[PDB]
Design a protein around this ligand. Structure first.
Ligand SMILES: *[C@@H]1O[C@H](CO)[C@@H](O[C@@H]2O[C@H](CO)[C@@H](O[C@@H]3O[C@H](CO)[C@@H](O)[C@H](O)[C@@H]3O)[C@H](O)[C@H]2NC(C)=O)[C@H](O)[C@H]1NC(C)=O
Ligand SMILES: O=C(CO)N[C@H]1[C@H]([C@H](O)[C@H](O)CO)O[C@@](O[C@@H]2[C@@H](O)[C@H](O)O[C@H](CO)[C@@H]2O)(C(=O)O)C[C@@H]1O
Ligand SMILES: *[C@@H]1O[C@H](CO)[C@@H](O[C@@H]2O[C@H](CO)[C@@H](O)[C@H](O)[C@H]2NC(C)=O)[C@H](O)[C@H]1NC(C)=O
Ligand SMILES: *[C@@H]1O[C@H](CO)[C@@H](O[C@@H]2O[C@H](CO)[C@@H](O)[C@H](O)[C@H]2NC(C)=O)[C@H](O)[C@H]1NC(C)=O
Ligand SMILES: *[C@@H]1O[C@H](CO)[C@@H](O)[C@H](O)[C@H]1NC(C)=O
Ligand SMILES: *[C@@H]1O[C@H](CO)[C@@H](O)[C@H](O)[C@H]1NC(C)=O
Lengths: 142, 310, 308, 153, 149, 312
């Protein structure tokens, strides 16, 4: 993809799509927000308060301390790995969804690299492509 | 054309089907940082005992040094000043757990030292100012002159809070040595309460010298309700209470083991390696935490992909 | 033309990337409702103590009322009738957990008041009908105080729970007053049990107008074992015992509610739960098969599509 | 296809004469399977109890507290996330099947109509001609010439 | 694509099957990292489970029951649904891989063939066996056979 | 030219969060269900197994019970028939077993011989060695000597390098009349003392039912003698004295296992009373009472993933 595009996350024959970038930045921010905020934190005290003649209960506390570490680590690791592809495949869709958004917009006014060669088309003609307000019958016969 | 973003990104992420995929922007949800010093807990400073144990600080050990409130207790791994005169403590771990979090704590003299003139004692294993002494907060009742009379003393609680009483019994070295200290060979201690009913008898046994002491001393405790009276009665071998402790109990905590020392700060999660100031959902600092803490996880990197692949 | 449905729906769900998605149809999996009364647990009535503790019910507390099978026990948060004569109960929390779920329970006279003939004793801390009484199920022995030797063999088919006690008077006078010997013992013997109780005289505070105490003990007499008693004088001897069939475990429930003729799979001190749902948020102190307790209010799945 | 259509309670046909359970029943059985599995795969449940520790056992009482609070934190966090995860994965399945069905008509008729998710034919298509668009048995070579001639106007 | 290729990628009528090596080994390397990461991210730290409490310790014995049964429910439920959640991710990834290889061929030849409906294209020109490497390799030349279409 | 997916002769089926009984090209199960049905070593450490003896009966010298210097876990069968040949109790018996669950060095030591205690010795018919009655081999029962039993004062000092486990006991006679027959003094004590321990035992006379033909009981106690501390015994007459002790080395903990199988020459990282488990899988459905680095116990029969594409 393009490296010089800092406007956001089109190219003219750059200006990033302000709509899909706003829908993406707001959405992925909400996913990290829900991952952190859904956690429930309560006051707990850990201190190993059993003497050497209470070692059986000391082992019972171990089995639950060690048991919870096994559960959280497996969930946290797999949640990271599962949501990362769902994020990296979420970006595989936005390109083709923005491609078809413009492809189905101008139907026969150009020829299909994710690029289109158009009738010649100016700045006001391509800023209308980004807006979603592209007038097809204005350049239909050409 | 239609394209996507790219920048000067070096951070890498892992995903469920690919490993090490360079990504525009990334964020870690695993907190690995700690300030390395003890702080308060939700706004309350903790009770720290540098070289003294919870038993050594509760009793009047001369090797130890009055804060009325604390969120949790910190004592080092093995404090150097437990019981100067060797012995044990009854329900010691539950008494430590009871005092782990106290809203109000105040030492109170209940029966003065003069009110037991039986005689007093002082062992060389508990030095005060070079000249040996005993525990400050409890009194060792010995016999006096020619005979060992019976002691009947009863303290009634008139405060508005629960108060903690501490008393003990002395276990002599040999049966002939007890006759020296307490004229009667058969001895007892009877502690009466609406709740408590115990009767202690000394166990004469040959033991190894700890701090130059073959004899031991065993301590007990209860909590006296605000309008209940506790009643002692002894024939000797009695370690009587001089002070008490008004207690306001509002929550629970635990005894934290850390050699670190205090810092004037505040935190929500405490760790023997130093407090934590984190809003993250996971951490890999230490298993023994106090306070509202994130979940402990065995991993080094929990980085999500916030940007697209570069 | 191709398109998707839409209706006049107000149901909302939450997307991991979007908050407040208006949805066609939604289904909730978080159970939030209860029927608000104690019920049976898998078709078995609970043992509900009105104003009595497990001690006052097991013993013969005169202020307590006199069911052979139950799934769990319910007692008020602070029962008023524990021990009319103040004292303790050894391994009381283990005795309660043992009786929490019982398959068969039967009160049996093993050695009656007539076989105790020393005299019987009463105190005013246990009032029954304007006249001072004692526990129905045990007998207080009072003296010349002689040595009592009587044993009971378990001839029944099921396990038997025996209860006995010892009296700790206030002063040395109250003992000699009732129990002639100044030094006294109580020895109980079983194929498993081997104990010997000595009274502990101590000055204590008044509880229910009594400075003395009474400490109770118990074991499970195996179906063909024999229990043997020998006491000098401070004996609170058993007159009744309880046969027990133990098939499962439960807990003691704390609630102020009363019984209704209902049945449920999950019990809660705020009301029973009839739910196949996977989650609930009612109360943590649950008994039986229950959904997982959760600190949340909304668990709404999206069964339909997003709306305009 | 913005907003979705409201009048569909059972496609919408554009025709002079007048003005889909194949993919719906597949989605009805598909999403209902997800709700049933969320409830039924955790059907394993045993007995539960309360609290039975006295005042001199408050250390064990805190142990039972640590695991109960530890379990509530687990079940709450996973269920809240499972809702959020399966709610979007449900909504994304709707937008997924739309293009699968939108392309189905686009694949079926190619030059006999021109591409909002709507189509209007180059030829005449009556109330019975739209049978073949719903059934999947559309005769493309039949309306070939009728689309060719009315295309060069 | 109603019928699967039981006899096998690409299929041509010129006629034989030839699987795509670039797309297959990429997907095999992806799923292998999925099953591995499911098994590898599990942490085990040697716990010894046994009933060690006596008759008068049933309450502590009952507490161990709640945590033994409790962890059983967390692991049983999460394992059953992780299978269900990740099985759907795979079968949708296979439908995702059919289209991603289909669009690579469809965007390769733009106006030089015709989409039939079975996932096949009939060339407007004649394309031999050395011509169909261009479609498979990704080295397909559009302007050569342009006017023939 | 066409584009499509694979299909082969396979009936392996998986389930989906939206579909069920899908016919798939290839499948793989991640739930461990197989076990070799025999006890093995844990990370290369043999287990301590008792055929018909219990830990108490083996620790003491029960004549029916039979040496190993290192083990990972302890196996005693469901109900051992050789427990306490002379009936009684064991103080902190549950805590003591958890200590001996994993021992890196175990070496029996005679600290106070049988002859030294004589100055005689007691035998019961409840502990028959070989028809002719004997007693525990590791602890000695003391009876009056020359019709008058005086105070016995014998102390042992640990001079070894490791902690060592001392065992002693007290006899509770049936009636007070039998005590005078065995021990001259009617009132008796047993004082045991270390820098750690302080206790004084008193006989507990009570009429009991016969167990193994004996109604008197013998209760046992134990402590761990720190390296340079000494233990001092002083008893009036009811003494079951220690003759043998055990040096111990503690570098890890385990549990006591209940199984009827016995040793096979195998190795494992995870053990089950039904047989060990060889597993890279993170889940299994064998047994809950596991020992070792084990997969997580799960209630399921099939946890099969999809390794191939869907087949028609
Ligand atoms: C512990 O000390 C407290 C403080 O004196 C004692 O409590 C008091 O006991 C006396 C007599 O039992 C109570 O006397 C009365 O007040 C009521 C009206 O409330 C009146 O009807 C009576 O005639 C009498 O004057 C006193 O109220 C009570 N104080 C409190 C705060 O309860 C207590 O008895 C001592 N505990 C023991 C066991 O010694
Ligand atoms: O008399 C008092 C009152 O403070 N203390 C003596 C104690 C006390 O008698 C014993 O602890 C009772 O068991 O004993 C001291 O005695 C030891 C002595 O036993 C020993 O054999 O030598 C030591 C020095 O080597 C001590 O003397 C003690 O300090 O504890 C002396 C006290 O006066
Ligand atoms: C308790 O009652 C049982 C029932 O009679 C007694 O058990 C019997 O004991 C005799 C002799 O030991 C045997 O011959 C019988 O077969 C036993 N019966 C059963 C059902 O086992 C037992 O002896 C009584 N206990 C005591 C000590 O009196
Ligand atoms: C137990 O035996 C050891 C070894 O004799 C004793 O330890 C020594 O004590 C003497 C005198 O107190 C010292 O000279 C030695 O240096 C000590 N050795 C060590 C290694 O410290 C010990 O005192 C005896 N224990 C008891 C309780 O008597
Ligand atoms: C969504 O709506 C609910 C109630 O309508 C409200 O609690 C919440 O704050 C809303 N979210 C946003 C982001 O507005
Ligand atoms: C799936 O197949 C298995 C055996 O083939 C059978 O037990 C089960 O009932 C089947 N499910 C359905 C829904 O047919």
């Amino acid at each position: 993809g393009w490296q010089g595009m800092v406007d956001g996350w089109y190219h003219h024959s750059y200006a990033a799509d302000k709509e899909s970038t706003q829908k993406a930045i707001d959405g992925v921010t909400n996913k990290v927000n829900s991952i952190i905020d859904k956690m429930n934190t309560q006051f707990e005290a850990v201190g190993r308060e059993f003497n050497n003649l209470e070692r059986r209960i000391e082992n019972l506390n171990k089995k639950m301390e060690d048991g919870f570490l096994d559960v959280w680590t497996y969930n946290a690791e797999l949640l990271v790995l599962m949501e990362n592809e769902r994020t990296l495949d979420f970006h595989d869709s936005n390109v083709k969804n923005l491609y078809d958004k413009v492809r189905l917009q101008l139907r026969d006014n150009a020829k299909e690299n994710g690029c289109f060669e158009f009738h010649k088309c100016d700045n006001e003609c391509m800023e209308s492509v980004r807006n979603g307000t592209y007038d097809y019958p204005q350049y239909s016969e050409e | 054309c239609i394209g996507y973003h790219a920048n000067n990104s070096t951070e890498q992420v892992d995903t469920i089907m690919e490993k090490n995929v360079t990504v525009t922007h990334a964020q870690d949800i695993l907190e690995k940082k700690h300030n390395g010093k003890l702080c308060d807990l939700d706004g309350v400073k903790p009770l720290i005992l540098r070289d003294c144990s919870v038993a050594g600080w509760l009793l009047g050990n001369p090797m130890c040094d009055n804060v009325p409130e604390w969120s949790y207790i910190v004592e080092k791994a093995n404090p150097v000043n437990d019981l100067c005169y060797p012995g044990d403590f009854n329900d010691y771990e539950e008494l430590k757990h009871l005092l782990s979090r106290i809203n109000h704590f105040e030492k109170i003299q209940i029966i003065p030292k003069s009110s037991w003139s039986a005689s007093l004692g002082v062992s060389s294993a508990c030095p005060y100012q070079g000249k040996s002494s005993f525990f400050r907060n409890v009194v060792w009742l010995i016999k006096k002159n020619s005979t060992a009379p019976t002691i009947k003393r009863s303290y009634n609680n008139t405060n508005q809070e629960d108060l903690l009483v501490l008393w003990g019994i002395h276990h002599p070295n040999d049966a002939a040595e007890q006759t020296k200290l307490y004229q009667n060979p058969t001895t007892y201690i009877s502690v009466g309460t609406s709740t408590l009913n115990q009767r202690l008898v000394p166990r004469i046994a040959t033991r190894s010298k700890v701090n130059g002491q073959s004899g031991r001393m065993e301590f007990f405790w209860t909590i006296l309700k605000p309008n209940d009276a506790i009643n002692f009665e002894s024939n000797g071998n009695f370690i009587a209470p001089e002070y008490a402790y008004k207690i306001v109990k509002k929550g629970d905590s635990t005894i934290m083991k850390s050699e670190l020392e205090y810092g004037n700060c505040n935190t929500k999660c405490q760790t023997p390696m130093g407090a934590i100031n984190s809003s993250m959902p996971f951490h890999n600092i230490h298993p023994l935490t106090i306070g509202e803490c994130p979940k402990y996880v065995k991993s080094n990197r929990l980085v999500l992909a916030t940007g697209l692949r570069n």
